[model samples]
Target: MTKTITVAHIQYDFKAVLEENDENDDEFYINVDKNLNEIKEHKIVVLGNSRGVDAGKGNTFEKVGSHLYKARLDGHDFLFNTIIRDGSKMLKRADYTAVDTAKLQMRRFILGTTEGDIKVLDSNFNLQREIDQAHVSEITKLKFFPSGEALISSSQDMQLKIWSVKDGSNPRTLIGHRATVTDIAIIDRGRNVLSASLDGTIRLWECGTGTTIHTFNRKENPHDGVNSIALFVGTDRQLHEISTSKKNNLEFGTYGKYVIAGHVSGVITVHNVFSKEQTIQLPSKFTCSCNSLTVDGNNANYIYAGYENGMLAQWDLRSPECPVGEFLINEGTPINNVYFAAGALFVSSGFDTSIKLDIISDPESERPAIEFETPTFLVSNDDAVSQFCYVSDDESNGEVLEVGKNNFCALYNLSN
Candidate 1:
C-alpha cells in the first residue's frame, strides 16, 4: 500500500517580517494573536548546509511580492509541518504501528517520562494510573520485579527507588551514585540489583537493606564512564556439561556470572561478578563511545554492543580478543538501545524514527541479514527514541515497548 502524503501552506503578515530586520540570516515568521493560547507558532530559522553542499537544490523559501512570500516544500518533507500541533513537543514517545495478528496474550506495562511521571497502562492501551511525581528528574530506567508485585526505577536525579506496583508506595530509596544512573539490572528475583552510572562505577546493591555489596571499576588509574550494561548468565546447557567438575561453580548455572558494561571511550569491560579480579577490556572496531549492550538470553557465549558510530558488534565470550562480526546501522546515527529476542536483533537509534530489526539464525555467522528492514513503527517527527524492552516468552510471540525522547511510548506485537 502507498503511504499517506499531505501538504500545507501558512501565511504571514508582511509587517511582522520587517520588524525583525536581519539580512545575513534567513528567518521566517507568522502573525498570530496573543489570545491564541493553544497554538504556539515558532520562528522558523533556515541555517544552510554546514557541509558546503548545494543548498539551493531542494526546498526554497522566497519573497514572491512585497506583501507575500512563498516557500517551495516538496515530497515527504511536507509531513513535518502538516501534522504539527501545539503542546505536541514529545520528550518521550510511544505508539503501536502495524504488526502481525493473533500473537501473544495481552499484558499491562508501565511508562516513565521526562517530567518524572509514570503512566501505567492496561492490556488495551488504556491509562490505568498516572503517578505525576514519581521522581525529581527524568527517569533513566524502569523495570518490573520478577514477581510483578514491585517495581524498580532509576533516574537522572542519581537515585534508585523500589515501589509497590499494586499500592504505588515507594518504601525504599537507594542512593549513592554521584551522576546519572543510566541503567539497572535486577538480579535473583530482585533481591539484588546492579546499577551502571556515569560516575565510572558499577554498584551491586542488596535491595532489602539498601547496602552496596560491591563496586566494580576499572583497574587502571583512570576509569571510563559506564553508559550501558547487560548481565550474562550461564545457561542450563552449559551447566550440564560441567556439573560434576566443581560443586561450588555457581558460574555455570542460571545465576548471573558476568557483567558487561559499555563505556564512553568505546571500551567494553567484562567483569566476573564472582571474582574480584581485574576486568577484561575489549577495544571498539572504531574509536567511538559504546552506547548500548545486550546479552543473548539463551546463550552464555554471545553478547552485543552498540556504539556511537552506528556500529553493532557481536562478541563471543569464548573468544574475547575481537568481535565476531560488526554491522553498521547508519553512518553517524548513535545506536541508543540493542536487544536480542526471538532470534532477532532489535536496534534503535537516539534520533532515528524507526526501529530496525534483523533476523539472525546463527550467532557465529560472519554477518547478520544485511538488509535493514524498518518496522512499521514510528516516533514523532521531532522525537528521538531512547530505549526498548522486549517482553516475551520462550516462543516467537511477544511485545516490544519503545520509549523515546517524546512523552509517548510505542508498542509492537510480534508473532511467528
Candidate 2:
C-alpha cells in the first residue's frame, strides 16, 4: 500500500529591501519548510551575498558536521570561519575550529558572481583555488559538472569555458552564440553540451570535438533571451524504448525526455529531444525577465521558474495548455536561482541575503489545504527536516515521492 503524508504550510517573514530605488520593504514571503523537518539538517546550507549592508550580508551559512560554516563577504572577497554549538546552545561567533576534528567535516563551497569571479573554498574556510576573471569580463552563470571534475562557466564575453577542476589549468572555450551565453547544460554524458544565449537561440555542441551539433532558433522575436535550459527524458514510450540499452544504461521509461527552455519574455518552451521538435510554449502576460528555471525530478510534469521581480511560479507541463498550478514564492528581493534536491524541498537564492528552502509536500493527495494567501517570514534555526521521500518500488514513479501527513506543505512559518 502507498503511504501518505500531510504537509502544513508554515509562513515566515524576513527583512528585504528593493534594489531598484533602494527602498526598505517589509513584505512577508512564505518559507515552505521553515521547521527543517523535510531537509537533511547536515546538507542544509545558507549562502547570502552582501551587496548592501553588512549585518549578515554576503554570509554563507552551511552545516558541516556539528559546526556551521560561515563565509562573510568582507570587501571584495569573503572571510570564512565556523560557528560552534556549546552544549544545548548555538554559537554564532566566528572562530577557528579544528579542521581535523570528527565534529567538523570540510565541504568546499563554490562562489560565483555577476562580476565574473569564481572561487572555491575548502572545509576550513580556506581558499583552495581561484579563477581569475580579468579576461572573461562578466560571468553570467557557473556550474560544476556532475562528477565535479570540471567547472563550466558562461560569461558575457560570448564564450563558455570548461576548466579542469584537478589542475584548474586546461580551459576549453566553446564559442558559437552571437550574443552573451546565459546558460549551458551537458547532455549524453558530456558528449554534447547545450547553451542558451541572448541571441535568442539554443546551440548544441559536441563536447569532445568542440564542434556545433545543432542550433535551435526562436520562432518569434522572443524579445527576451533564453535564461535556462534543462534536459530530461519525456514520457513517450516509443522514444524511451529506443534509447534504452544495456551499455547506455539509459532508462527508456522516464518523463524527463524533454528539453525545457525559459525566456526573459515570460515564455517557456518544451522541446522533444527524441523527435527533435518543439513540443509546446507556455505563455504568460508578465513581461518581467525570467531569472532561473528548474523541473521537479520526481514530478516531471511540474516546472518551477524564478523571475526578476522576485516571483516564483510552478507550472504543470503534462497538459498541452501548460496551466500553472501554484505561485510558490514571492519575495521583496529578486530571485536568481532555484534548485530542487532529493527531498521534496527546493532552495531559492537571489538578491536576498538569505537562501530560502521551500517544502511542497503532497499536492495531489492533499486537497483543499490552506492556500498561501500572503508571504510569511521564518526564523533561521540549526535543525534539519525530511520534506520529501524517495520512491524505489515503482519504476514509473519518479525517483522521489511526497509522503506522510501534510505531505505537500511548507515547514517554516515566517508569519509567526
TM agreement with the true structure for every prediction: 0.67, 0.59
Best model per lDDT: 1
Give per-residue CA lDDT, model 1, range 309-344, as digits (tens): 777787776677888766665546577778776656
In terms of lDDT, model 1 sits at 0.60
List where candidate 1 sits over 4 angstroms from the true fold: 1-106, 235-256, 362-383, 393-396
Q: Candidate 2's error at 373, in angstroms?
A: 7.4
- List runs of model 2 lying over 4 Å from the truth: 1-108, 222-224, 239-256, 320-322, 328-334, 344-357, 361-416
lDDT of 2 by residue, 1-416 (tens): 11111111211212232123233322222222322234211211112232222234443332223212222222211111111211112211211100110111233434444456556545343467766672255666555565656767777888887777567774578877788887776664565667898888887776666667667755766445888787776655475544543332222222245678888776888876445578878775345777677777666767777666656666667654544543434333455555564433333433222233334457663211212331111123322211121222222322221111111111221111
Point to the candidate with the largest TM-score: 1
Error of 2 at 230 (Å): 1.9
Error of 1 at 413 (Å): 3.1
